[PDB]
Design a protein around this ligand. Structure first.
Ligand SMILES: O=C1N=c2ccc3ncsc3c2=C1CNc1ccc(S(=O)(=O)Nc2ccccn2)cc1
Lengths: 298, 260
């Protein structure tokens, strides 16, 4: 740990603080995930055990790489490849001018590839959101922070006490479904995809119920026909208002047909019919995808 | 998950991973102070710990992997075999359970024969020796993949195949020499046969590349294990599977022959 020089804090954490560091011997810039450890009196954290373990198996150009794990006495450090900034910061800078559609496409494309890699390696990310996606100046975007990640060799039981972000949480999880599925991750990208297009958060709920209602208000309230089983789900209710589905050309106007097509399939209600990363990559929306570079402010 | 898309990829992958995350077939021999029997007693105990804390069966299959793996390269004195086991369970829990039991709980279930400090240190030692590679393919996982190939699903065949696979965890004596995908194949057909006279389905032979013939050896072993099950020194697993949650399948009388 002595060959590292901390440069600045680039992210707070309940799991750990992240610092931009530098390897004093090789010159390599890296991101250090420092873990409390000395506290908790409960040994090594789960998010640490799962992030390290699962990430060591995932080597993809669209997933931040885990370079090393330095565990010792009371300190456990995760050494990661470093990237200039996250998508949240980028979307902000882009507020006035906005992100060009070719870059939005490029980003969605790569995300779907990284995610498709996770899924075909039985790993669910579960916390896809703008601040968990990193980008560089050459046009690359990568999935990061596999703290809430889960391997699903066997179906992953859903937490009773919601952990994932609210705004990008899939409707299944809100309705109280039993297990997670690769579907929850595609829903998140689906939400991120629209946000890039509209410059606005698609379903910015205040509470679990406000979240569920914003989704319905936009995509219409689900029923047994659209999603067999809805009405039976734990947290579903008959007293739920019956809203009508809105025309996607009013939700995401800047998008063409292929665009509205993909997005609707990514935000498909029944998680057995919601498009997969693998399948989305073959959608015509990507027939002309390229790798544009973004303009990033320090 | 719950979508046919990656199911094939995932299978192919777990197959590769089981070869990598697999232990040393004959590590027990080179282990100066411990024997299969001590292990069988240890795994059985873990089975009870699992019940006591209502942990998943996956959490049990994993811990077993962590232990066998650890013992494959670390000499352990009988006096510590349980400390190893406890930590392995602790880790499997942190990895697989939604929320694992507190360390205090693992120190407790050991009759304080070990310190909370000891548990935590053994945890680090296991993590270091296992080099953090905890996501190991289990027999329990492969059954899950095979279950999709039922026609239709028979929740009794499953509980039985689970019972048989959970029984293999106990006797390293003949089982460390079979890959989880194999033990699972054995456990599946044997269960499918007992409950519905059906055999290893063609869909599976194609998906796994395993023929009924190729599973014969493990099969013979498992069938034999299924038979003597009532007279085994360890019974925690049988007591677990007579419950109505698993449809008391541990009570189903095994066939006398398999006609293979
Ligand atoms: O570069 C990184 N590698 C990481 C590997 C794992 C991981 N888990 C959680 S965050 C993370 C990793 C990072 C973080 N990179 C990053 C770099 C710059 C920004 S930012 O400039 O958009 N925002 C900032 C910058 C300084 C202080 C607070 N927020 C955000 C994330």
């Amino acid at each position: 740990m002595e060959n590292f020089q901390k440069v600045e804090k680039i992210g707070e954490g309940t799991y750990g603080v992240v610092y931009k560091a530098r390897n004093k011997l090789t010159g390599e810039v890296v991101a250090l995930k420092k873990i409390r450890l000395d506290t908790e009196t409960e040994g090594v954290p789960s998010t640490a055990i799962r992030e390290i373990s699962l990430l060591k198996e995932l080597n993809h150009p669209n997933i931040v790489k885990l370079l090393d794990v330095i565990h010792t006495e009371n300190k456990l450090y995760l050494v990661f490849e470093f990237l200039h900034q996250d998508l949240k910061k980028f979307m902000d800078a882009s507020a006035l001018t906005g992100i060009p559609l070719p870059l939005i496409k490029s980003y969605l494309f790569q995300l779907l590839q990284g995610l498709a890699f996770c899924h075909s390696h039985r790993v669910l990310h579960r916390d896809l959101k703008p601040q968990n996606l990193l980008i560089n100046t050459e046009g690359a975007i990568k999935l990061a922070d596999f703290g809430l990640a889960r391997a699903f060799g066997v179906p992953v039981r859903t937490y009773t006490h919601e952990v994932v972000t609210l705004w990008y949480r899939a409707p299944e999880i809100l309705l109280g479904c039993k297990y997670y599925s690769t579907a929850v991750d595609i829903w998140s990208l689906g939400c991120i995809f629209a946000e890039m297009v509209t410059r606005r958060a698609l379903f910015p709920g205040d509470s679990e119920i406000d979240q569920l209602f914003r989704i319905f208000r936009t995509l219409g309230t689900p029923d047994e026909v659209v999603w067999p089983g809805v009405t039976s789900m734990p947290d579903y209710k008959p007293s739920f208002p019956k809203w009508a589905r809105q025309d996607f050309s009013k939700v995401v106007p800047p998008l063409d047909e292929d665009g509205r097509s993909l997005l609707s399939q990514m935000l498909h209600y029944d998680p057995n019919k919601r498009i997969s990363a693998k399948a989305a990559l073959a959608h015509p929306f990507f027939q002309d995808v390229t790798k544009p570079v973004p303009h990033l402010r320090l | 998950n719950e979508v046919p898309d990656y199911h094939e990829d995932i299978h192919t992958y777990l197959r590769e991973m089981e070869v990598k995350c697999k232990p040393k077939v004959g590590y027990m021999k080179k282990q100066p102070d411990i024997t299969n029997s001590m292990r069988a007693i240890l795994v059985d105990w873990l089975v009870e710990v699992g019940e006591e804390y209502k942990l998943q069966n996956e959490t049990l299959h994993l811990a077993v992997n962590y232990i066998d793996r650890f013992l494959s390269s670390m000499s352990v004195l009988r006096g510590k075999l349980q400390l190893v086991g406890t930590a392995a369970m602790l880790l499997a829990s942190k990895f697989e359970e939604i929320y694992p039991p507190e360390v205090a709980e693992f120190v407790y279930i050991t009759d304080d024969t070990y310190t909370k400090k000891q548990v935590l240190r053994m945890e680090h030692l296991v993590l270091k020796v296992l080099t953090f590679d905890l996501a190991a393919p289990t027999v329990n996982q492969f059954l899950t993949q095979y279950f999709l190939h039922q026609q239709p699903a028979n929740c009794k065949v499953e509980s039985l195949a689970m019972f048989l696979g959970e029984l293999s965890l106990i006797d390293a004596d003949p089982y460390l020499k079979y890959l989880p995908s194999v033990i699972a194949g054995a456990a599946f057909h044997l269960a499918l046969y007992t409950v519905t006279g059906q055999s290893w389905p063609e869909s599976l032979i194609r998906k796994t590349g395993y023929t009924l013939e190729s599973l014969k050896p493990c099969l013979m072993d498992l069938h034999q294990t299924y038979l003597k099950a009532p007279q085994h020194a360890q019974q925690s697993i049988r007591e677990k599977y007579k419950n109505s949650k698993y449809h008391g399948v541990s009570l189903l009388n095994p066939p006398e022959t398999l006609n293979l």
